[PDB]
């Protein structure tokens, strides 16, 4: 789903 | 505070393209998802495609698959919507909106659902 | 392509009572990604619910969202007099995001 992309961008930039 | 300014109203001949900007200020612009959703006089809400700047990735619906297309400028923080061989059943109030976001600031976790919104544009297809 | 239905398109009622808004979708939607928007005349879109429950800041308490699979409901606990006006749902679980045609809350007399 589109619509869960920046969700899991977000996970990223905030992990590493 | 998440702030979407959209261009002003257009009157556009049949089978023209027309192109809507939308400026977005504070929070961030790259990471978070923007949508096209319009509004034909007395009618509803429709979703047309969305864009995620970071990834330039696209998202579009397939009753505008090959009609439109829908661009992000990340140095100016500028959204754009075109809209091709266009009909008087395209005159419609066209909206930009973006994601809004979790807890306090903007800048939190995506929920995905349409938190802001731009004032609307106004495109009149006519001759 | 999930079709969302909202059923009644209107629905009159008077101020300080209660209503109940239906959004049934034609298949299950994922993660609850049901959304819920205020329109009045004239004016842009407002969100009032996400995640078919959540509530997001500055949103009166007495809206509230409920259900889940392909049965939604808005509830609007007291309707205060910039209450009427047009409620749309979307579902955003999957890619082709979709709205429901609305219902208009008027007034009756």
């Known amino acids: 789903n589109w619509f869960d992309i920046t969700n899991w961008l977000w996970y990223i930039k905030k992990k590493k | 505070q998440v702030q979407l300014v959209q261009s002003g109203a257009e009157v556009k001949r049949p089978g023209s393209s027309v192109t809507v900007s939308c400026k977005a200020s504070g929070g961030s612009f790259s990471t978070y998802a923007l949508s096209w959703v319009r509004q034909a006089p007395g009618r509803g809400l429709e979703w047309m495609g969305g864009?995620?700047?970071?990834?330039?990735?696209?998202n579009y619906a397939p009753r505008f698959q090959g009609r439109i297309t829908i661009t992000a400028d990340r140095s100016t923080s500028t959204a754009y919507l075109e809209l091709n061989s266009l009909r008087p059943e395209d005159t419609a109030v066209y909206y930009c909106?973006?994601?809004?976001?979790?807890?306090?600031?903007?800048?939190?976790?995506?929920?995905?659902?349409?938190?802001?919104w731009g004032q609307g544009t106004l495109v009149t297809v006519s001759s | 392509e999930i079709v969302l239905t909202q059923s009644p398109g209107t629905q009159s009622l008077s101020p300080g009572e209660r209503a109940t808004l239906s959004c049934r979708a034609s298949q299950s939607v994922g993660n609850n990604k049901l959304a819920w928007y205020q329109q009045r005349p004239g004016q842009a879109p407002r969100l009032l619910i996400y995640?078919?429950?959540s509530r997001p800041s500055g949103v009166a308490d007495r809206f509230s969202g409920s259900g889940s699979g392909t049965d939604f409901t808005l509830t609007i606990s007291r309707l205060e007099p910039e209450d009427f006006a047009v409620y749309y749902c979307?579902?955003?679980?999957?890619?082709?995001?979709?709205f429901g045609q609305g219902t208009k809350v008027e007034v009756k007399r």
């Open positions: 995640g078919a429950s």
């Open positions: 979307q579902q955003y679980g999957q890619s082709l995001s979709t």
């Open positions: 909106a973006r994601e809004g976001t979790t807890g306090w600031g903007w800048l939190g976790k995506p929920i995905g659902a349409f938190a802001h």
């Open positions: 864009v995620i700047p970071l990834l330039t990735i696209t």
